[PDB]
Amino acid sequence: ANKTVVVTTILESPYVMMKKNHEMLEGNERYEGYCVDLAAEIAKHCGFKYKLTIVGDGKYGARDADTKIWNGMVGELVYGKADIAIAPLTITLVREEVIDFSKPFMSLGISIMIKKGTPIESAEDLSKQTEIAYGTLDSGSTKEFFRRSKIAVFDKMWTYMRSAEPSVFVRTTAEGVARVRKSKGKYAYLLESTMNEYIEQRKPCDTMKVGGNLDSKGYGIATPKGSSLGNAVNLAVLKLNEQGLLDKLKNKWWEC
Amino acid sequence: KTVVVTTILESPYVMMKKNHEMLEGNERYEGYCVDLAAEIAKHCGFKYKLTIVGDGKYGARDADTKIWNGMVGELVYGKADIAIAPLTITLVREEVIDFSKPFMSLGISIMIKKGTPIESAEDLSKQTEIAYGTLDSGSTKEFFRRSKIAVFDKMWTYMRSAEPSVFVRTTAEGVARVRKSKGKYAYLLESTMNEYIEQRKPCDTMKVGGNLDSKGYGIATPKGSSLGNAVNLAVLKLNEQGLLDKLKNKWWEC
Ligand SMILES: [NH3+][C@@H](Cc1c(-c2nnn(Cc3cccc(Cl)c3)n2)o[nH]c1=O)C(=O)O
Ligand SMILES: [NH3+][C@@H](Cc1c(-c2nnn(Cc3cccc(Cl)c3)n2)o[nH]c1=O)C(=O)O
Ligand SMILES: [Cl-]
Ligand SMILES: [Cl-]
Ligand SMILES: [Cl-]
Ligand SMILES: [Cl-]
Ligand SMILES: [Cl-]
């Protein structure tokens, strides 16, 4: 690279977190987490300096159907605000058409979060009932998945979600988790298995993952199309995996 | 023109059809990869011819000369246009060819004959009574040669100095070596084949311990190929539509 690399990411524990004493720290030293360590290791094996930045709008990435404008970390790569995205960013077909992804460094699938005691076990259960509302993050891969799915059960769920009143969408993942906890079992949150399981095993220990994953995908490091950094970043990811660092980082950062 | 697809004869990925001697062309073969090639050829809009890799190898290179063999070599040296097989995505392979995003996941595991006193990779590295090795021309050999983890590096130090040779030249040779060694050989292979062989007679093998790593199979094309981008989007499409899970269930006793 010829400049200091601008890395965009999102504040999502345990991937990126503010240090207890971040107010006294400068630059990259303010943050900590799985993706903070991963960026240092990618930058080390690619030979560039980098500055960690938090995505301005706090979004993963969605595409406006009318204007085709992207937002979130995806938009920051498409419109030249960032050089690389190191975050739990899901590899998707639609995103792969405007940005480049490295090979996945972590796997996941869409899963269901419920409040302990809710009579729900699968997405089939959710689509066949009207007592428990459900929704997902509005600006992420999960919304994209349901919007595009030709699969009957998932299309039926999408049709219900976008027509529900009050809205069942949430604009952050934390909003979704909180909605489950305060809805007395009347709201089920559709989110990725990684965060679902993470929340499950932590206080107040009142949420739970039910059913199996709805699909199988992974997180990847993203760069803009044509960037002379994607090839290097891709090899770095594969080297860190083959050397065993990704397993070490997983164990490092991963109660009820 | 017609795209030359290189693959390898491994069940249930690629197999000979019943009465294959009387069939011609692509109709001689069937399996997960045979169905997968048709789907990718459909979404990418090209005609293709299935061919089995000449040397029956997955792909390794000489450390000094950097010359490749196996399916990787057929792509690097212009003998095939695309590889559709259980070919593992690795660092060294991605330096000379391109891979799509993984269409299937797997890890390195340990195969033993039933009754062998082994449960993990650490157990093997702590002794020599029970020999252990892996395929010589594959990604598992690359893993043990390039792994920075201590226990794996000790297994590599043992393998390349053991006597008689613990390496094998085909996966069938490794499995046969476990079944014939009366419990004195452990074969390091990928979990997909380990668990598949486990549920097939003679039913005298089993998988012990968790996977030593986590990786995936990807569709390979030579660098600069005009099929690369399209093939990658096809895999992601087939995954989104659930067809990869359909093929798995379709093609996947003790
Ligand atoms: N990853 C999706 C976003 C996304 C998620 C999601 N779930 N978990 N993450 C990351 C995460 C946060 C906190 C803790 C842990 Cl363990 C993992 N993203 O769920 N629906 C979506 O749409 C995207 O790229 O749009
Ligand atoms: N995949 C590796 C080869 C490779 C394998 C391996 N194991 N299983 N396969 C594919 C397979 C065969 C038979 C049945 C089933 Cl289910 C799966 N390849 O083990 N060590 C290696 O080095 C490579 O690309 O080099
Ligand atoms: Cl993982
Ligand atoms: Cl359906
Ligand atoms: Cl021709
Ligand atoms: Cl899989
Ligand atoms: Cl170690």
Curated annotation (Swiss-Prot), chain A:
Disulfide feature: 205-256
Site (Interaction with the cone snail toxin Con-ikot-ikot): 63, 147, 239
Keywords linked to the UniProt accession: Cell membrane, Disulfide bond, Glycoprotein, Ion channel, Ion transport, Ligand-gated ion channel, Lipoprotein, Membrane, Palmitate, Phosphoprotein, Postsynaptic cell membrane, Receptor, Signal, Synapse, Transmembrane, Transmembrane helix, Transport, Ubl conjugation
Chief location bin: membrane
Residues the UniProt record annotates as site (Crucial to convey clamshell closure to channel opening): 120
One GO process term, biological-process aspect: positive regulation of synaptic transmission
Domain of life: Eukaryota
Compartments where located: Cell membrane; Postsynaptic cell membrane; Postsynaptic density membrane
Regulation: induction: Down-regulated in the pyramidal cell layer of CA1 in the hippocampus by global ischemia.
Regions of this protein lying in the Extracellular compartment: 119-256
Tissue: Detected in forebrain. Detected in dendrites of neuronal cells. Expressed in the pyramidal cell layers of CA1 and CA3 and in the granule cell layer of the dentate gyrus.
Example of a GO MF term: amyloid-beta binding
Sequence positions that bind L-glutamate: 88, 90, 95, 141-142, 192
Glycosylation site residues: 2
PTM: Palmitoylated. Depalmitoylated upon L-glutamate stimulation. Ubiquitinated by RNF167, leading to its degradation.
Gene Ontology CC: one annotated term: postsynaptic density
PTM annotation (Phosphoserine): residues: 149, 183
Entry comment, domain topic: The M4 transmembrane segment mediates tetramerization and is required for cell surface expression.
Anything else known: The postsynaptic actions of L-glutamate are mediated by a variety of receptors that are named according to their selective agonists. This receptor binds AMPA (quisqualate) > L-glutamate > kainate.
Primary role: Ionotropic glutamate receptor that functions as a ligand-gated cation channel, gated by L-glutamate and glutamatergic agonists such as alpha-amino-3-hydroxy-5-methyl-4-isoxazolepropionic acid (AMPA), quisqualic acid, and kainic acid. L-glutamate acts as an excitatory neurotransmitter at many synapses in the central nervous system and plays an important role in fast excitatory synaptic transmission.
UniProt similarity note: Belongs to the glutamate-gated ion channel (TC 1.A.10.1) family. GRIA2 subfamily.
Subunit description: Homotetramer or heterotetramer of pore-forming glutamate receptor subunits. Tetramers may be formed by the dimerization of dimers. May interact with MPP4. Forms a ternary complex with GRIP1 and CSPG4. Interacts with ATAD1 in an ATP-dependent manner. ATAD1-catalyzed ATP hydrolysis disrupts binding to ATAD1 and to GRIP1 and leads to AMPAR complex disassembly. Interacts with GRIP2. Interacts with GRIP1. Interacts with NSF via its C-terminus. Interacts with CACNG2, PICK1 and GRIP2. Interacts with GRIA1 and SYNDIG1. Part of a complex containing GRIA2, NSF and NAPA and/or NAPB.
Protein name, UniProt field: Glutamate receptor 2
Protein species of origin: Rattus norvegicus (Rat)
Gene (UniProt): Gria2
Positions spanned in the full protein: 413 to 794 of 883
